Structures are given as structure tokens and as C-alpha cells.
Design a protein around this ligand. Structure first.
Ligand SMILES: O=C(O)CCC(=O)C(=O)O
Ligand SMILES: [Cl-]
Ligand SMILES: [Fe+3]
Lengths: 18, 429
């Protein structure tokens, strides 16, 4: 899921290394 | 303190230390060649293999290379496959392997590594906690919940497990049950519990149940550096951006965008109504547990700065209009979306994830009475054909007590003080 209006996810970004 | 040398490695300790000294001195290229020579000469040495992996790790940092880091991740696993690997070294190597896998976004790979660590060290509670984070990062709250239940069954006062268990309960809308776990976990002061997410959700859980103590935790989270203020509680921030709950168009500098929205508001309205009438399934119910009650759905045209092509087939003139404004279409920390809300709807007080956007609301169909929005200490109403602008990183709250539907158009823009360099490099949200 994604943080659109709120902040309900454990993380709101996706890790892509450097 | 840690025991990293097996029987044979102790006999070659002088060569192992000379290679590691090169790494600590920042001579990474000489260090990788020294450890590759040790791995050549002593192919079974776990310490030499771990040195090779640590050097590749350092080289990945120096070059900012994902490919070099992928090499390190494999060599960390090789350490674990060698004969007679000391337990401390085995744990260190696989723990860094999982950490670097997560850094690259290999969440499935990290999960396997964490599962192997728990299998190899069944008495290490901290590894089970790390596995629970692995599940949380991949979105598997059910397996994460099982892991922390296993941790709390043996170590009931593990504060790290408590805050994560409470987080999961809260995310499942078990609001009352989550409060003691979040509260006791933060109060435990265990490493990993002093985290903005747990202050955020404890205070919000308390607000939903009417616990007046909520803002004491917001103040403490602010005191400990997790929040810009007790009002502005976003967690993905760029420090120093002008912070105020309500903005005028002139204050934002986006007056050309606002004029276009207000001059052309009827075409935006008409396309939204046509979707309501002929393609209602494009409106998707809000799914972030932000409603106390009622009905609230959104029809999204852009998200994370990416146009939804099928959605723009449903509002082609609106998408054509907005494409002239990269300050919103390129806002990778915001959306462009229709938002319909029906009577009997109360949206809990809540905060968006980032201070890097400002949120515009264009009124499309606004009932004469019963609809209002609070941001911080100030409540306002929409007007058809007019734009409101607020910073939704401040706590905000919405009510819909009209006798018919309320339709608005939401347009997120980059915070105006973010440079073009920051707008291209910030991770999308
Ligand atoms: O009023 C709406 O439709 C959405 C309100 C809200 O929470 C937001 O725009 O962030
Ligand atoms: Cl204007
Ligand atoms: Fe909101």
C-alpha cells in the first residue's frame, strides 16, 4: 500500500539502493 | 568482543589483520586485492571471505554501485556456506546480507535471509524482531503479527516487539488494543522504540478513543525530534520549509495554476460528474482507515508524479488542462484526484506523510451547509469554483453533514521553497 492521504504504512517509500 | 576466527583462521591471523588494516585505512582497492589473495590461498577461510565481502560493501559505498553491492551480498552468503564458521561471524555476515538486501529493495531476498537466521539461532529474540520488520517492509502484516506474538510469548516485556505489535494492531483498526503496546513499548526505551512512527500512531489511537493524553505524546515526540511541531507531524520531511496550515495562492507562487483551475472549474466538474454517472467504479473508496464513518471515494488522475492513462480517458479535458503544470503533474509526493464525500462522513484528525507538498482543493459541487475542513486550529469551507490551499502535513479533519454529495478536485503541488534539484531527487511518496 501507499501513503496517499495518511501515514498508515510502516514505510511510505520504496528502497532502490543507491 | 566477538569471536570471528575458527581454528585455522587463528593460524593466519597476521595475514588477516594486515588485509583488514588496509580496509580500515580507507585503501579499499588494496584491501579487496589483499582479501582476494587470502581467499585464493585459503579458500575455506571464513574470515578472509568475510573480509572480501566487507571490502565489496565498502567499495559499493565508495562507488554508489548497486551491482558492486549485489556482489557483496553474495559473498556474505558464501561466508555462511564455508566449513567451521564461528557463530558470531555467521550471524554478522547474514545480518549484513539481509540489511544490504533491504537497502537494494530485495525484500523477498531479505526475508529468506532473516528466516535462515532465526532457524540457525532459535534463541536470539532480536533476530525474530528483525524478521518481523522484514514482513512489515514487504506488507505482510499477518506473518509479522505472528512473529511478534512468538516474541512476546517468551519475552513479554520486549519493548521493540511491543511497539511493533501495537503498530500492527493499530493498522488493523484494533485501536484500543494497540494503545498499551505502543505506550509500554515507547516507555520501555528499548533500542528501536524511540521512533516517530510509534509516537505518531499512539497519539492518533488515543485521539480516536477520546484520550486527552494524546497531545502529551505529540509534545514528547516533538521534544525528541520526531515532529516539526505538535501540529505538523509528517515523518518524510525536508527541514526548513515554510510551515503554515493555510496558504493563499499568492503565497504559493502558483497563481497561474490557480487561475487555470478557477477559470476552467466547470469542465473539471462536468467530467467528474460524468464519471459519477457513467463510470462510477473509477471512484475507489478511501483505504487508509481515515474514516470514523461514512462514504468517501477518490478518482485519481496522477499519483507519485505518474499519469494514469486509463483514468485520463475518463477525464481527458481535465488531464489535458493539468498537463501544462509540472508543479503538480511532476509532484512525486502528491496526487491529482477527484474526491467525493457523502453525508454522515467524519474523517478522523490525521496528518499526511510529508511536508514537501501543499494540497489544493477546488470546489466542484459543494452543498450550502454541512461540509467543513479543519487544518490545525482553523476550520474553513469550500466554494464552488474556488481553490483552498492547506499544508496537509498539519493535522486536519473533515466533516460531511449535508443532505447531498460533496465533490472536490485535489491538486498537490511541490512546496514552493523546494529547489528544482530537490524536486527531482526526493523519493516518491
Ligand atoms: O476532503 C477531502 O475530500 C479530503 C480531505 C483530506 O483529508 C485531504 O485532502 O488530505
Ligand atoms: Cl490566483
Ligand atoms: Fe488528508
Amino acid at each position: 500500500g501507499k501513503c496517499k492521504d495518511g501515514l498508515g504504512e510502516y514505510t511510505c517509500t520504496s528502497l532502490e539502493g543507491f | 568482543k566477538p569471536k570471528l576466527l575458527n581454528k585455522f583462521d587463528k593460524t593466519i591471523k597476521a595475514e588477516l589483520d594486515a588485509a583488514e588494516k588496509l580496509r580500515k585505512r580507507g585503501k579499499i582497492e588494496e584491501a579487496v586485492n589483499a582479501f582476494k589473495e587470502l581467499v585464493r590461498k585459503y579458500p575455506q577461510s571464513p574470515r578472509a571471505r568475510y573480509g572480501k565481502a566487507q571490502c565489496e560493501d565498502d567499495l559499493a559505498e565508495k562507488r554508489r554501485s548497486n551491482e558492486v553491492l549485489r556482489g557483496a551480498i553474495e559473498t556474505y552468503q558464501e561466508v555462511a556456506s564455508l566449513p567451521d564458521v564461528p557463530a558470531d561471524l555467521l550471524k554478522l555476515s547474514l545480518k549484513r546480507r539481509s540489511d544490504r538486501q533491504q537497502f537494494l529493495g530485495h525484500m523477498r531476498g531479505s526475508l529468506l535471509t532473516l528466516q535462515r537466521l532465526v532457524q540457525l539461532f532459535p534463541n536470539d529474540t532480536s533476530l525474530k524482531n528483525d524478521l518481523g520488520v522484514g514482513y512489515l517492509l514487504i506488507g505482510d502484516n499477518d506473518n509479522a503479527k505472528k512473529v511478534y506474538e512468538e516474541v512476546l510469548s517468551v519475552t513479554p516485556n520486549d519493548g521493540f516487539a511491543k511497539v511493533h505489535y501495537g503498530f500492527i494492531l493499530k493498522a488493523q483498526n484494533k485501536i484500543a488494543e494497540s494503545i498499551p503496546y505502543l505506550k509500554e513499548g515507547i516507555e520501555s526505551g528499548d533500542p528501536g522504540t524511540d521512533d516517530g512512527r510509534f509516537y505518531f500512531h499512539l497519539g492518533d489511537a488515543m485521539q480516536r478513543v477520546g484520550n486527552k493524553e494524546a497531545y502529551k505524546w505529540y509534545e514528547l515526540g516533538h521534544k525528541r525530534g520526531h515532529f516539526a511541531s505538535v501540529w505538523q507531524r509528517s515523518l518524510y520531511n525536508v527541514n526548513g520549509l515554510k510551515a503554515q496550515p493555510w496558504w493563499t495562492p499568492k503565497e504559493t507562487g502558483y497563481t497561474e495554476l490557480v487561475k487555470s483551475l478557477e477559470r476552467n472549474w466547470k469542465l473539471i466538474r462536468d467530467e467528474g460528474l460524468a464519471v459519477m454517472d457513467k463510470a462510477k467504479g473509477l471512484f475507489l473508496p478511501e483505504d487508509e482507515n481515515l474514516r470514523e464513518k461514512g462514504d468517501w471515494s477518490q478518482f485519481t488522475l496522477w499519483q507519485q508524479g505518474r499519469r494514469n492513462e486509463n483514468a485520463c480517458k475518463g477525464a481527458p479535458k481535465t488531464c489535458t488542462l493539468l498537463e501544462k503544470f509540472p508543479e503538480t503533474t511532476g509532484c512525486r509526493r502528491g496526487q491529482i484526484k477527484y474526491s467525493i464525500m457523502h453525508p454522515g462522513t467524519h474523517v478522523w484528525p490525521h496528518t499526511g506523510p510529508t511536508n514537501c507538498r501543499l494540497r489544493m482543493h477546488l470546489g466542484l459541487v459543494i452543498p450550502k451547509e454541512g461540509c467543513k475542513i479543519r487544518c490545525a486550529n482553523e476550520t474553513k469551507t469550500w466554494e464552488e469554483g474556488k481553490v483552498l490551499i492547506f499544508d496537509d502535513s498539519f493535522e486536519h479533519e473533515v466533516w460531511q453533514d449535508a443532505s447531498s454529495f460533496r465533490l472536490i478536485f485535489i491538486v498537490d503541488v511541490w512546496h514552493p521553497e523546494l529547489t528544482p534539484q530537490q524536486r527531482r531527487s526526493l523519493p516518491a511518496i
